[PDB]
Design a protein around this ligand. Structure first.
Ligand SMILES: [Ca+2]
Length: 223
């Protein structure tokens, strides 16, 4: 997260870290046994880390649970990042409390102008590299589809939306991928891609979760 603020320990209780010996992507807990992330975060041998603030210090509220199954969206295209969404089933159910909690799926899509909360342990610099150890937060609005398509000609599908600031300076970044975009208490987006980070006229692009609720629900019901 570039240009954000320190969230505070366990104030984003649905935020997960995906760990393969190191943090490499975020994710969102959507019930006690399932995490949603970005398909471009796929790899084998994922441990899901819940209840994290400092990802380098054991602080006492963590739950570490290995993945038993990963399901990349059937139509994920790694060249265009269309359908950049994946489900991860935990080997055992998480213990839910005030610091580890699920986030609700949306029943409707959010409109441009809605303010959302984006969070992650990704890079905090637009030119250098500096990775934080504690969770960072950013409040950002959903942008109109017209401004999104004007910023990224020929690249925005109906399964994507832009959020952020056309002026630059505030954005998600590398290492935030897979993490949540939460608006009015519902998971509306997944950190997916962008050109650089926090560049002028290059806002962040997010997977539009409301298009996938039927697939998520049917997949969880049968796996
Ligand atoms: Ca920790």
């Amino acid at each position: 997260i570039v240009g954000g603020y320190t969230c505070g320990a366990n104030t984003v209780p649905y935020q997960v870290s995906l760990n393969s010996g190191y943090h490499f992507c975020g994710g969102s807990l959507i019930n006690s046994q399932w995490v949603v992330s970005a398909a471009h975060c796929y790899k084998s041998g994922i441990q899901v880390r819940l209840g994290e603030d400092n990802i380098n210090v054991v602080e006492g509220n963590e739950q570490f649970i290995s993945a038993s199954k990963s399901i990349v969206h059937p139509s994920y295209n790694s060249n265009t990042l269309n359908n950049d969404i994946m489900l991860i089933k935990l080997k055992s159910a998480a213990s839910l409390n005030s610091r580890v909690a699920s986030i609700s799926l949306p029943t409707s899509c959010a409109s441009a102008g809605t303010q959302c909360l984006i969070s992650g342990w990704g890079n905090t610099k637009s030119s250098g590299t500096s990775y934080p150890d504690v969770l960072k937060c950013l409040k950002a609005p959903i942008l109109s589809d017209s401004s999104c398509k004007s910023a990224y000609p020929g690249q925005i599908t109906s399964n994507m939306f832009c959020a952020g600031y056309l002026e630059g300076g505030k954005d998600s970044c590398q290492g935030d991928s897979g993490g949540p975009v939460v608006c009015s208490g519902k998971l509306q987006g997944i950190v997916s891609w962008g050109s650089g980070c926090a560049q002028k006229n290059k806002p962040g692009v997010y997977t539009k979760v409301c298009n996938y609720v039927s697939w998520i629900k049917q997949t969880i019901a049968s796996n």
